[PDB]
A paper describes a structure:
[name], a protein conserved among most eukaryotes, mediates 2’-O-methylations at position 32 (Nm32) or position 34 (Nm34), complexed with [name] or WDR6, respectively. Herein, using cryo-electron microscopy, we solve the high-resolution structure of [name]-[name] with or without a [name] substrate.
The interior of [name] and the [name] binding site of [name] are strongly positively charged, facilitating the binding of the substrate tRNAPhe. SAH bound to the active site of [name] via hydrogen bonds with four residues (Ser25, Ser54, Asp75, and Asp91) and several hydrophobic interactions. Moreover, the 2′-OH group of C32, the methylation target of [name]-[name], is located 3.3 Å from the sulfur atom of SAH. This shift, resulting from the interactions between [name]-[name] and the substrate tRNAPhe, places C32 of the [name] near the methyltransferase center of [name] and SAH.
Residue numbers in the entry:
A (entry chain A): 10 to 579, 587 to 707, 717 to 871, 879 to 972, 1043 to 1072, 1082 to 1310, 1317 to 1474, 1482 to 1533, ...
B (entry chain B): 10 to 207, 227 to 252
């Protein structure tokens, strides 16, 4: 879009006085140009302007016609805004004027500019400044003009700036006007800087005399700049630009140039002597001298110093270097004082600029500066401290600037040590080693290592540790670390390739490169876990393939081999090879690399491989194969026939994907495919009309057929009862088709049009998608219907549309809470296609389609309003029937939904829209008054629950409607109405007293408040601040008798405050926040008054919300510390409420400070920050915390303390591993107090102190700390024993030892000596574990320490003495003796567990080379001793038997079958019984089943009966374990002898019934997992047996279990069932039923494959005759015969079963012999058809919308019965019932 | 989940009702209970379950108490007040002179913040108050069910609870969110200390109020 050129009216005659009818002169061209509208031919004539002037280079004196022509050109140019490209157009044109005409144009354009400069309108100043700006850039016409008018332009700039400042200070209160004025100031300052920089007049002195007008204007400008810099109520951009300008002018205006660096230096140091500066400087820059300038002023001045001075070439010399160092010093001083967020961002930018300037200076500097700027200097140390403190700042700009600073620091050091011999500098090596000590979750580690890699080369980092690539790849399974790891790895291998192609110049280097970077990648791709695979494919693999595409050939050859060897074995590496190959090929094709070969290759992909990938079990493989087919580098490449067939195959099965991400990726790739079809069809058409390949008309026909069949599939996927994912996918892909093929409607040819394929019935189904319970489906259907052409009344007659309108009106008043959504969508559809009935024209009094949709909206809204008014009146009469018959919220919802679609800002019938809005507000208030008393209070054939539903839904709808109406930009909304709306929101949301109307009103109020901010009326935009003040002074004198409630976290007051604070412009000014936080922090402070509790309570309730709101975000940081103090000081208050509020606020503060949790469980170090970062961000907490800690420590000895919160904070701070300098704030002082906190008489405090002490101790100091901590324990003969002190000391040493063990485990070899010292110290005080110690808690902790020591000693190989001491501990324990007194002594179970762990450790130690034996541990009377022993035995057996690992049971557990067999019958503790059964399952039945006869007096058969009885009765994990055991026993019986099949028959039937039982619900997921595992293990025996052992009913029952679990709602069961299906299809007699043998497949196709295998077996067993009745009974669904499921569709099973039955009967021609067997089926099916006709008859009109659930279930049953009729009719060729039902229905 | 629906579909005031029922069929809480106390029932779903399973006989007496107000039920007496306050404890115990309650349930929880240590602290306070009420009311061998927050360290709570009860079990029903760390301690067989009144008490009561071991401390070397 362009703006039409305009001209001055009185110029017309002026240009008419020189025009000519013939049109020879330029004047006629001007006439032709000005009288136009298109801004395109004007441009052409503008070019031809130049030749017209060129063709008159003979006169020698400018023609007056040409004079007036150029004058009018100048006037037009100066009247053109900068948004118009024509302005630059004629600028460029006049740039090429002939040299003869220059002087007159100069003079006259000068005159025009001069008279422009004399304007005095304040708001016209911006245009003049923009004109001056334009005359500078590449416009030779204006450059000379302004060069001739320096005095005038400078005077204009000065006066304009002064006047704008005055107006801004006068227009206080309105912030839009102020914003415009600030922008004008900014453009003025920038233009002034441009002028000074870019005018060839300021060079030389030539004007520095005091009398020069230029000099005086410059001094005035400098004074204005200083005044605006020192100001603080302006935008910070203005002040920063002012500082730049100040430095530029000082540099320009100062005659003794060599003294400029010194003078500026003093100005920065605030040490300027007022008696030595020149007089003009003192006059203009009085603020700069004589002190007292803000910190922002100094910040911006040093910014300007760095930016606007010549640092290169050493022009400023030694004084320049001194200025550089002084600026660094000033910046570092400011860094510690600045706390405003925006000022911190500015300081980061300025520090990065300082590094740039240091680079430039250092390139030619003096040797003295080298010493002061090298990497070991103090300045660089401070810079590194800044970087380490700030790389993880919340603000993104901060972090980016820190990255720049770090890179520049390394460059500075390189420049300083250019006298280098060998590449690896000691500084770089030390930095690298220090960085490599950080954890891999530290995000700054990656960027810093990348910079270092580019500095010193990756070969040295690899030499330090050559497993780094693998370590980086192992974190790639965690998203939000993937980008950093990917970038680091990319930097690494780019550098490595550049290094290998160095001196060693051959071709073999690539091999090494491959084995460094590709082989680990292949291993991850084939065998990594799922998340790791997805993230590596999405983020890392494209980078590697793009950088080195010739590596693709290497990868494929490796993967293809691993594929083929798979067929040799009929391994995981051979199993993941297909997915990796598909990922590599998809990436290669999408980037156009060597794989761009016309159906994806000649031989890389085969039909079998592609079909296997497209249907694979892993979502990633399916997506990668689909992407290989769908997306290509060339956007118009032909889609081959093979790709079309594969895509149809894919669509058949992949419409029910459950992951929303997977579904979205599928839809996007399909859209890409449709775009390719559309774009290549145009190429085909072009070739066709252009009268190897296949005659493009053939390909066009193929495209048409393909698109038609795809649409057929998509519309088939909309069957009744279809899942949410399948409707979502179908509607998404249909909408994508409608959008993609809607392109060439302005064109001539289109290969496909969706509208042609839309029948009446397909339109009916699309509208019926409005009844889905999910709003996403409603939205997608609405969008698709709107995208179609000729749809409104083409597909619908008037009567049926009237029925639809009646249906929507009826849904708007239904008691079901979500029918109103359907009614709203239906009504919007009728409105936006002009399908409303004609009677609705009777509501209003009387092409622009906006006008007709507005009229329709008005009519429907008026109808709804009439109904609503009547219903509200009757509700006022009596609310019972209103809740029962006509709840009023449906109409309100429909009205709001109708309004939501309009553009409220651009209505056109305001005369009609005003009274309707008035009535709407009145009825909203009436309804709210009716239903609110029921919602604050309790209740006043209609239950109270539905009354409450009506009431709160009405509340919500009214709030949303008011929030909608607030967007009319108050006009249709008067100021009184807005005030009343705000009052309504305030009356609620502060008096609700209930959860309702807290979050209900908040959304509407937020909408109103944002609108109120953006409003230009001044009287309205002052409302939020006034409301904030009102509520604050309400808070102070709360008077607990008020309506405000303390429960529900507060009386909605936090929501009110949040909404008011939301009005503040984003990052704009945030002045309400400062006031609110000052007042709330003051209120929450300690109060002498007892009555002052409630104001202190609400504050902590409000503050909490303010500290977690996302909008306040980084603006709330400067208050955190204060808030923290409050919380902590509020934890010691005697009142309970203050402490509870303090706890909640402290939780919010912890989340705000340390961030959201990064992983579910471990929280190793993911939410901790170093002491340096924490105490740099909140430096006022270091004294406070320390002081507070000391206090509580001194309370411990001399006795609700706040020890808990202090320790909880302190536990999340650790010491920085790469602490280049010693800890400046030195967390060390905390250690003595933390230790003393361990002597608290509260268990939790002792535990917390033990946990918090760990981060504050260096690892190398842990041994000495442990020794000195142990030395404080009392010896056995001492006389002072304090149990709390001993327990705390023991907890501390236990946690310290645990931390010590988890490091220095294999890294060191010297810790053996330290461990020897530790164990000597522990042996010195072993007495606390024996029976002399009376309390069991202390014994337990000491025994835990001993056990940890045993674990350490075992893996680290004196020890003999330790072991005999441990044996002495165990032998004398109550584990052998027993507990004498029958009193529940504290700590007993914990003590028993500790003893048991130590005893088991002793037993293993003795065996591997005895105080107690496994045999007599298992006989102890304490269930927990038995449980621990059984757990140890179970893990041994599992690791030795199930997960063999080339191992066997240890020799000590060889003959335990009898023992466990006896225990199983003896045990009564369920938790141990389950473990006993698991152990029995783990052993070979051939070794313990024979012994069953005499050990427990049971034959194997009756033992099996016993196990099945257990499995039938229990309903916990023991059920699944018992089922597994019974199945194992049965399998053994069958596999040993052939005589068992006849003596286990009844047991086999009972087992089948048990499996069926365990398949059902009310059982844990483990039961169904166990069923699937059992069936998988016994497929070749009970499922695909060539000669079945069970009866046919039992075999089919097992198959039915498999099929019903394969449709389970939960993913693990489905995956396991697919594994069962793979086993079933992979058997010897079933390898031909399908083509996916030995393939793992998704559940969707697994259902079909299982049915295929079952039918093939039924034929193979030759037992089809009694089989068909059962399968047809499955088809009928005997369950009904008359919570939503996100995966299972009934009709999918019906369709697959019917299709395979047809295929079986066709290939067999089975022809049932006896009709009597099927006669029963015909009887029941005919009865069902009769009932279905009866039910469909008595169903009200438009039942698809009024009776959706009944209609849907009837339709599903009808589809079942029709499928069964189709099969029966095929078999009998009773089609009479078929015909009668077809006539009754159709 | 599914129980949020089933709470609205059925006559249950909240989903939490299904947590109580699923704890019967696995522990047989309602064996012979006649009078029961309900602590911290926000809408009253647990009170409703108890009334329908005990008060269905007719003589069942149920006392419910909460910090907020509740809609009254037939056969249940409601009390509004902080069970931490001594006055509320006294007025609760006022209902049980003579015949003691056979069952005491506590569903309370603080405003769960998300980080689990503070939740354990606050829940420990609430459980101490609930345990005080229990020991002051229910008959020996009785039942005490209490919501707990299973975090990293739960040994102390189990140790303290084991002292007063024969059996203590930790259960997570199906209705409890799998992401949530809540659980239920079911305490079977109220077995109060012999010398305990609402010797042994000097060691138990300090340890139950807090992990106070300042009863085994001595001013002379321990006897052998
Ligand atoms: N100190 C205290 N005194 C009394 N009730 C408390 C309390 N702290 C928390 N609560 C109560 O604990 C409950 C948290 S959820 C309660 C759920 C309820 N039992 C049900 O059947 O669904 C709320 O009722 C809250 O009021
Ligand atoms: Mg509500
Ligand atoms: Zn002075």
């Amino acid at each position: 879009q362009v703006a039409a050129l305009t001209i001055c009216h009185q110029d017309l005659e002026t240009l008419k006085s020189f025009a000519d009818v013939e049109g020879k002169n330029l004047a006629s061209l001007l006439l032709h140009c000005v009288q136009l509208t298109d801004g395109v031919s004007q441009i052409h004539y503008i070019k031809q302007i130049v030749p017209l002037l060129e063709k008159a280079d003979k006169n020698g004196m400018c023609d007056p016609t040409i004079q007036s022509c150029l004058d009018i050109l100048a006037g037009i140019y100066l009247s053109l805004s900068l948004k118009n490209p024509l302005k630059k157009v004629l600028a460029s044109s006049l740039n090429s004027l002939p040299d003869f005409f220059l002087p007159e144009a100069m003079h006259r354009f000068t005159s025009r500019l001069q008279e422009e400069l004399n304007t005095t309108d304040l708001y016209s100043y911006r245009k003049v400044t923009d004109n001056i700006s334009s005359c500078m850039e590449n416009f030779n016409l204006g450059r000379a003009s302004v060069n001739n008018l320096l005095k005038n332009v400078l005077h204009f700039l000065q006066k304009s700036l002064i006047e704008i400042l005055e107006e801004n200070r006068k227009c206080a209160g309105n912030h839009i006007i102020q914003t415009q004025l600030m922008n004008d100031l900014l453009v003025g300052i920038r233009v002034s800087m441009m002028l000074v920089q870019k005018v060839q007049d300021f060079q030389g002195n030539l004007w520095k005399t005091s009398d020069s007008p230029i000099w005086q204007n410059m001094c005035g400008l400098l004074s204005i700049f200083t005044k605006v810099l020192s100001d603080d109520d302006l935008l910070q951009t203005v002040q920063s630009t002012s500082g730049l300008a100040i430095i530029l002018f000082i540099k320009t205006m100062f005659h003794p140039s060599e003294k400029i660096p010194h003078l500026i230096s003093s100005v920065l140091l605030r040490s300027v002597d007022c008696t030595s500066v020149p007089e003009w400087f003192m006059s203009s820059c009085r603020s700069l001298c004589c002190g007292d300038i803000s910190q922002s002023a100094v910040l911006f001045l040093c910014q300007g110093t760095l930016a606007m001075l010549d640092w290169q070439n050493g022009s400023m010399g030694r004084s320049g270097e001194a200025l550089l160092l002084d600026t660094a010093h000033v910046l570092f001083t400011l860094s510690s004082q600045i706390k405003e967020p925006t000022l911190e961002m500015f300081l980061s930018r300025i520090l990065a600029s300082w590094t740039n300037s240091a680079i430039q200076v250092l390139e030619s500097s003096s040797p003295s500066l080298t010493d002061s700027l090298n990497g070991n200097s103090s300045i660089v140390g401070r810079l590194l401290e800044y970087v380490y403190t700030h790389w993880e700042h919340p603000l993104d700009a901060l972090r980016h600037q820190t990255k720049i600073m770090f890179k520049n620091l390394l460059q500075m050091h390189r420049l300083t040590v250019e006298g280098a011999d060998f590449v690896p500098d000691p500084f770089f090596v030390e930095l690298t080693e220090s960085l490599l000590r950080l954890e891999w979750h530290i995000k700054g580690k990656y960027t810093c290592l990348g910079c270092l890699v580019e500095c010193i080369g990756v070969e040295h980092i690899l030499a330090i540790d050559k497993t780094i690539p693998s370590q980086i790849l192992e974190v790639m399974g965690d998203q939000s670390l993937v980008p950093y790891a990917s970038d680091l790895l990319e930097t690494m291998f780019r550098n490595h390739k550049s290094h290998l192609k160095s001196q060693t110049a051959e071709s073999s280097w690539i091999d090494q490169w491959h084995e460094t970077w590709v082989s680990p990648l292949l291993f991850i791709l084939c065998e990594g876990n799922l998340d790791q695979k997805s993230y590596v494919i999405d983020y890392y693999l494209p980078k590697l393939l793009s950088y080195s595409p010739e590596s693709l050939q290497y990868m494929v050859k490796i993967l293809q081999t691993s594929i083929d060897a798979k067929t040799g074995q009929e391994s995981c590496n051979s199993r993941g090879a297909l997915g990796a190959l598909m990922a590599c090929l998809r990436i290669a094709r999408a980037h156009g690399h060597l794989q761009s070969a016309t159906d994806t290759w000649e031989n890389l992909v085969s039909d079998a491989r592609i079909k296997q990938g497209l249907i694979h079990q892993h979502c990633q493989v399916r997506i990668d194969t689909l992407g290989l087919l769908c997306e290509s580098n060339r956007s118009t490449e032909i889609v081959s026939m093979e790709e079309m067939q594969w895509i149809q195959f894919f669509i058949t099965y992949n419409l029910n994907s459950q992951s929303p991400g997977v579904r979205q990726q599928i839809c996007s790739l399909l859209k890409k495919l449709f775009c390719r079809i559309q774009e290549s069809s145009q190429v085909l058409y072009k070739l066709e009309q252009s009268k190897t390949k296949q005659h493009p008309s053939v390909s066009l026909q193929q495209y048409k057929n393909f698109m038609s069949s795809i649409c057929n599939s998509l519309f088939e996927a909309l069957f009744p009862g279809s899942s949410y994912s399948t409707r979502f996918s179908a509607l998404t892909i249909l909408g994508s088709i409608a959008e993609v093929f809607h392109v060439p409607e302005g064109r001539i040819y289109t290969v496909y049009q969706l509208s042609h394929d839309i029948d009446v019935g397909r339109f009916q189904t699309l509208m019926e998608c409005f009844t889905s319970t999910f709003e996403d489906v409603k939205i997608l259907a609405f969008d698709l219907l709107m995208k179609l052409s000729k749809t409104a009344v083409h597909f619908q007659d008037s009567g049926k549309l009237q029925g639809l309108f009646q249906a929507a009106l009826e849904l708007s008043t239904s008691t079901k809470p979500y029918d109103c959504v359907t009614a709203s969508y239906l009504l919007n559809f009728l409105i936006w296609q002009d399908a409303l009935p004609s009677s609705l024209s009777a509501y209003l009094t009387q092409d622009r389609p906006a006008a007709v949709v507005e009229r329709n909206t008005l009519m429907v809204i008026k109808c709804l309003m009439e109904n609503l008014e009547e219903e509200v009146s009757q509700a006022e009469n009596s609310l019972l029937q209103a809740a029962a018959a006509f709840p009023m919220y449906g109409r309100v919802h429909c009205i709001t939904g109708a309004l939501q679609k309009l553009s409220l800002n651009s209505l056109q019938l305001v005369s009609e829209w005003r009274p309707v809005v008035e009535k709407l507000l009145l009825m909203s208030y009436r309804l709210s008054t009716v239903v609110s008393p029921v919602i604050q209070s309790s209740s006043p054939d209609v239950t109270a629950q539905m009354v409450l539903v009506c009431c709160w839904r009405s509340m919500k709808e009214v709030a949303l409607l008011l929030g909608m109406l607030c967007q009319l930009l108050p006009g249709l909304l008067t100021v009184e109405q807005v005030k009343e709306i705000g009052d309504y929101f305030k009356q609620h949301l502060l008096q609700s007293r209930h959860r309702g109307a807290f979050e209900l009103a908040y959304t509407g109020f937020v909408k109103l408040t944002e609108v109120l901010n953006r409003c230009p009326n001044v009287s309205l935009q002052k409302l939020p601040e006034q409301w904030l003040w009102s509520v604050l002074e309400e808070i102070k004198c709360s008077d607990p008798s008020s309506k405000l409630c303390a429960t529900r976290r507060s009386a909605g007051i936090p929501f009110y405050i949040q909404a008011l604070l939301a009005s503040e412009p984003k990052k704009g000014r945030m002045d309400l926040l400062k006031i609110t936080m000052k007042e709330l922090i003051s209120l929450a402070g300690p109060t002498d008054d007892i009555q002052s509790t409630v104001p202190q309570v609400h504050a902590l309730n409000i503050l909490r919300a303010l500290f977690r709101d996302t909008r306040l975000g980084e603006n709330i940081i400067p208050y955190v510390a204060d808030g923290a103090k409050a919380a902590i000081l509020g934890f010691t208050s005697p009142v309970w409420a203050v402490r509870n509020s303090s706890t909640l606020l402290f939780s919010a503060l912890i989340t705000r400070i340390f961030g959201v949790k990064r992983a579910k469980d471990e929280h190793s170090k993911t939410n901790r920050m170093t002491g340096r970062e924490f105490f740099s961000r909140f430096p006022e907490l270091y004294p406070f915390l320390l002081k507070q800690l000391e206090t509580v420590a001194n309370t411990v000895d001399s006795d609700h303390p706040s020890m808990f919160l202090l320790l909880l904070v302190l536990e999340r701070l650790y010491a920085s591993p790469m602490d280049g300098t010693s800890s400046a704030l030195s967390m060390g002082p905390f250690v003595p107090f933390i230790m003393r906190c361990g002597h608290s008489p509260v268990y939790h405090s002792r535990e917390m102190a033990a946990r918090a002490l760990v981060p504050f101790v260096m690892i190398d100091h842990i041994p000495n700390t442990i020794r000195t901590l142990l030395s404080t324990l009392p010896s056995c003969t001492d006389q002072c024993f304090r149990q709390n002190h001993i327990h705390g000391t023991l907890l501390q040493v236990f946690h310290l030892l645990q931390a010590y063990s988890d490091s220095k485990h294999g890294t060191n070899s010297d810790f053996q000596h330290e461990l020897t010292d530790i164990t000597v110290c522990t042996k010195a005080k072993l007495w606390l574990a024996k029976r002399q110690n009376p309390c069991l808690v202390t014994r337990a902790v000491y025994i835990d320490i001993l056990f940890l020591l045993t674990c350490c000693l075992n893996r680290s190989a004196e020890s003999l003495g330790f072991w005999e001491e441990v044996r002495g501990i165990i032998s004398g324990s109550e584990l052998i003796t027993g507990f004498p007194w029958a009193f529940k002594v504290p700590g007993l179970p914990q003590y028993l567990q500790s003893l048991t762990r130590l005893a088991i450790a002793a037993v293993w130690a003795a065996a591997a080379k005895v105080p107690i034996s496994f045999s007599q541990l298992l006989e102890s009377a304490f269930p927990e001793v038995r449980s621990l022993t059984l757990e140890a035995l179970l893990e041994k057996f599992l690791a030795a038997a199930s997960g063999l690992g080339e191992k066997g049971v240890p020799p000590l557990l060889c003959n335990m079958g009898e023992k466990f067999l006896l225990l199983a019958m003896k045990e009564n503790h369920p938790e141990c019984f389950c473990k006993i059964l698991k152990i029995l399952h783990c052993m070979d039945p051939g070794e313990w089943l024979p012994q069953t006869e005499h050990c427990v007096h049971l034959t194997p058969k009756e033992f099996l009966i016993w196990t099945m009885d257990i499995a039938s009765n229990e309903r916990s994990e023991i059920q699944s374990v018992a089922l597994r055991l019974a199945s194992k026993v049965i399998s053994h019986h069958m596999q040993t002898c052939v005589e068992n099949r006849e003596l286990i028959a009844a047991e086999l039937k009972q087992w089948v019934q048990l499996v069926i039982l365990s398949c059902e619900d009310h059982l844990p997921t483990e039961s169904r997992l166990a069923v699937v595992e059992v069936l998988t293990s016994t497929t070749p025996l009970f499922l695909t047996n060539p000669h079945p052992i069970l009866e046919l009913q039992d075999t089919l029952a097992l198959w039915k279990c498999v099929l019903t679990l394969l449709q389970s709602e939960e993913q693990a069961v489905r995956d396991a069932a697919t594994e069962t299906v793979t086993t079933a299809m992979s058997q010897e007699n079933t390898c031909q039923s399908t083509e996916f043998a030995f393939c793992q497949v998704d559940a969707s196709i697994a259902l079909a494959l299982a049915l295929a295998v079952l039918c093939d077996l039924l034929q193979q067993w030759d037992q089809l005759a009694p089989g068909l009745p059962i399968l047809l009974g499955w088809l009928l669904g005997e369950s009904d015969d008359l919570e939503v499921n996100f995966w299972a569709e009934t009709l999918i099973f019906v369709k697959y079963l019917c299709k395979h039955l047809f295929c079986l009967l066709s290939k067999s021609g089975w022809r049932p012999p006896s009709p009597e067997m099927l006669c029963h089926l015909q009887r029941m099916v005919s009865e069902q058809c009769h009932l279905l006709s009866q039910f469909f008859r008595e169903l009200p009109p438009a039942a698809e919308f009024v009776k959706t659930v009944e209609f849907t279930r009837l339709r599903i049953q009808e589809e079942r019965t029709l499928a069964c009729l189709r099969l029966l009719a095929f078999l009998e060729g009773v089609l009479s019932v078929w015909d009668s039902y077809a006539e009754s229905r159709q | 989940d599914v129980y949020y629906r089933l709470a609205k579909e059925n006559g249950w005031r909240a989903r939490s009702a299904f947590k109580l029922l699923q704890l019967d069929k696995e522990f047989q809480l309602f064996q012979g209970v006649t009078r029961a106390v309900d602590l911290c029932a926000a809408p009253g779903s647990w009170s409703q379950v108890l009334s329908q399973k005990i008060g269905g006989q007719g003589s069942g007496h149920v006392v419910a108490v909460d910090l907020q107000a509740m809609a009254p039920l037939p056969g249940v007496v409601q009390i509004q007040g902080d069970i931490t306050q001594l006055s509320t404890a006294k007025e609760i115990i006022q209902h049980f002179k003579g015949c003691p309650a056979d069952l005491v349930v506590c569903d309370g929880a603080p405003d769960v913040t998300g980080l689990h240590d503070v939740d354990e602290y606050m829940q420990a306070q609430l459980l101490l108050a609930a345990l005080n009420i229990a020991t002051h009311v229910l008959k020996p061998g009785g039942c005490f069910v209490a919501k707990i927050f299973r975090g990293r360290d739960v040994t102390l709570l189990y140790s303290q609870l084991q002292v007063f009860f024969s059996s203590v079990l930790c259960a997570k029903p199906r209705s409890s969110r799998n992401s949530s760390i809540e659980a239920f301690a079911v305490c079977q067989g109220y077995d109060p200390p012999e010398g305990f009144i609402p010797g042994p008490t000097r060691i138990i009561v300090p340890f139950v109020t807090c992990g106070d071991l300042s009863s085994y401390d001595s001013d002379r070397s321990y006897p052998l």
